[PDB]
């Protein structure tokens, strides 16, 4: 079995990553955080966790629920970049695929900034730092997608994904962008899934195929619903948004693409057991995060499998979102729903 060879180049990484895994905030620790009175207490409490002294450079009067999000995220990004720097070959190739998604977000976020005439010096403070590439600010220059493709996006690794973007009208608004935004993901996920199928060893292969499958389903259910915002979005446009790799495909994705009402979507999901209950009751966004963490928790049980990088990343992403939710409740001095974080560990 491949665990025999895996450690040749990744044994060091697998150790460090699981080092981070052992640092994740536990169910009990969130409760100890929940009891704080102020952000100044939340900082002091956090110092007892594996987050350590990260905020020690921030004055008491400077703490805000915004700044805590920035610093907590910054720690994650440095740890991610450190892990990437120590990698090579297919593993380095694998990690670079992860950042593609974030920079696809950044490109969309950057272009709408020009549609609304906001300054690059401001927009570049909201971009996601893992989605950074050299030419990113140059997106500010033009409006039509053809110019942006010809002058910038031809060069970035995103270039292959634009197969279906140029069908746009000659003039651009934000609504076109979110359609373009999704079209890029469809190509990106399908390419990423294909790359996993070819170049990643088992069991990590089957693990990642599961994780990416969930993401494809999550996007599908979101898009099938939110697309009803417009007076209409054509079914052959919807079919260009829904990715092909998910559990829903093709049996359910067709109905979702064809659906023109909520009850149509609900009927479509009624058949798939994994999601049979999601729309019938309870908060939808929590259910997705709930399943997402349970999948990551299960993924950690495997060994000598590079998928741990993805499981660690998504887990700590949710950890930040847990922290900010608690901090926001603390700062705004409202607590009746402070408990609603999601903690599988």
């Amino acid at each position, epitope marked *: 079995m491949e665990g025999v060879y895996f450690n040749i180049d990744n044994g060091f990484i697998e150790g460090v990553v699981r080092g981070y895994r052992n640092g994740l905030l536990s169910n009990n620790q969130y409760i100890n955080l929940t009891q704080c009175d102020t952000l100044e207490d939340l900082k002091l409490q956090l110092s007892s966790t594996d987050y350590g002294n990260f905020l020690s450079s921030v004055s008491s009067e400077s703490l805000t629920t915004s700044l805590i999000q920035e610093y907590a995220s910054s720690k994650l990004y440095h740890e991610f970049n450190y892990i990437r720097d120590q990698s090579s070959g297919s593993t380095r190739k694998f990690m670079d695929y992860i950042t593609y998604g974030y920079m696809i977000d950044n490109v969309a976020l950057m272009i709408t900034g020009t549609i609304h005439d906001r300054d690059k010096g401001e927009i570049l403070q909201r971009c996601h730092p893992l989605g950074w590439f050299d030419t990113l600010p140059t997106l500010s220059v033009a409006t039509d997608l053809e110019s942006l493709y010809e002058t910038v996006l031809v060069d970035t690794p995103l270039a292959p994904y634009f197969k279906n973007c140029f069908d746009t009208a000659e003039e651009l608004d934000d*609504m076109n962008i979110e359609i373009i935004r999704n079209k890029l993901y469809k190509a990106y996920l399908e390419d990423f899934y294909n790359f996993v199928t070819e170049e990643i060893p088992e069991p990590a292969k089957e693990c990642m195929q599961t994780l990416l499958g969930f993401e494809a389903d999550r996007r599908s259910i979101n898009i099938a619903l939110n*697309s009803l*915002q417009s007076s209409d979005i054509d079914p052959d446009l919807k079919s260009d948004l829904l990715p092909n790799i998910g559990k829903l495909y093709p049996l359910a994705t067709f109905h979702l693409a064809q659906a023109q009402d909520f009850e149509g979507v609900r009927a479509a999901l009624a058949n798939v057991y994994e999601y049979r209950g999601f729309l019938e009751t309870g908060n939808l966004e929590d259910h997705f995060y709930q399943l997402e963490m349970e999948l990551c928790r299960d993924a950690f049980t495997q060994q000598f499998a590079i998928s741990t990088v993805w499981a660690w990343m998504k887990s700590k992403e949710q950890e930040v979102r847990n922290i900010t939710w608690i901090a926001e409740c603390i700062a705004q001095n409202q607590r009746e729903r402070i408990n609603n974080y999601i903690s599988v560990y």
Partner: nanobody
Amino acid sequence: QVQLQESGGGLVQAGGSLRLSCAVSGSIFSGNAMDWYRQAPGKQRELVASLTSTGSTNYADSVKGRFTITRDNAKNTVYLQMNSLKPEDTAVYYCHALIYRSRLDLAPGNYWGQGTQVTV
């Protein structure tokens, strides 16, 4: 953060009209699509009528032709009614709301009521 709950219903004699209401909070009709679902003693639950964001109104009129829709955005609540009730109509009626949270195609806001019983 949205709380839905409905009112009215209960037992009423056949052939009479009946009126149901469903409150909504922390949100506005802008980007709102909203429905009623029946659930008979037979376990399955089903759509009967709807308010779309654009003001169109879906119905199960093949079997609920005398159920009706009302738009209440000026008061940010719900008052939907039916005429000439029949004994087969005895069901828990749930109001449902789908919120187009934002442009970003994250998971949308989705909300259900607690269900109002109806008896004939």
